[PDB]
Design a protein around this ligand. Structure first.
Ligand code: SJY
Ligand code: SJY
Lengths: 139, 139
């Protein structure tokens, strides 16, 4: 289905990175938050769903099932939250390659997301993740 | 061309809203920032261009031409900044319709962006802005 995402967290320099993956394309969006709160996840989901068809979000643990705001975001935007489900180390190599081009970690995280979404697999031919998600939604 | 945007600022409850419009689709992305700094605009442009083809950004005044970080963002991401160029009152009516569904202004701003991007013109038939930008990029 064209609206399936995976949501996860990752950690770098004592900061928290929210990562959404569009499962069929590998497109990612990410955001650095001060702390891993309900509100932050709800805000991120609402932005995401305003940009793409988001039908179902898959997570790997219980954290998101206990936030009052995440459930009000789910419901407002029409997002099914489903339990049950790598990319998270591609990110980190690219973050390492750019880290000292940016003062702020968040900048490096977005430079990493950029390159993840724009590049071709193996550097030649076919579609980027950013091309594939557009191509998937367009049909 | 498929990569042309308009960037502008707007103000509500003493907070600053950055608005990017995809000129051919009317798709919008927006973000509430504490203050109207170079860094914030650069960060927003870098996120945007990591998500969509952004070839040229049109602005209406000189503010963006005097930020060292905005120029380093332009150059890093391959974005031509061009001088010379409404939607900004559709936003505000919808913000008013949702305002007391959300504690934070930023939430109302994203609920407004959601509805702006998802709705059909006149409420029936054709494509939403979010459909049109995908349809434009897919060709
Ligand atoms: C080449 C490039 C592209 C985008 C960029 O965004 C920022 C920023 C920022 C912030 C916004 C709010 C709080 S910090 C920077 C500056 C850095 O990180 O070097 C930067 C540099
Ligand atoms: C239905 C719905 C959907 C998304 C939402 O995001 C937030 C938030 C937030 C924040 C993140 C960081 C600092 S404040 C809220 C709560 C509110 O504004 O009522 C909310 C409610």
């Amino acid at each position: 289905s064209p609206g399936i995402w995976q949501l996860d967290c990752t950690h770098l320099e004592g900061k928290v990175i929210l990562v959404a993956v569009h499962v069929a394309s590998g497109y990612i969006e990410a955001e650095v938050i001060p702390a891993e709160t309900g509100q932050e996840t709800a805000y991120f989901l609402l932005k995401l769903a305003g940009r793409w068809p988001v039908k179902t979000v898959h997570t790997d643990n219980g954290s998101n099932f206990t936030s009052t705001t995440v459930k009000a975001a789910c419901e407002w935007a029409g997002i099914k939250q489903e339990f049950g489900i790598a990319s998270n180390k591609e990110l980190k190599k690219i973050i390492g390659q750019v880290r000292d081009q940016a003062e702020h970690l968040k900048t490096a995280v977005q430079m990493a997301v950029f390159i993840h979404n724009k590049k071709r697999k193996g550097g030649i031919g076919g579609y980027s993740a950013g091309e594939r998600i557009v191509d998937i939604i367009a049909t």
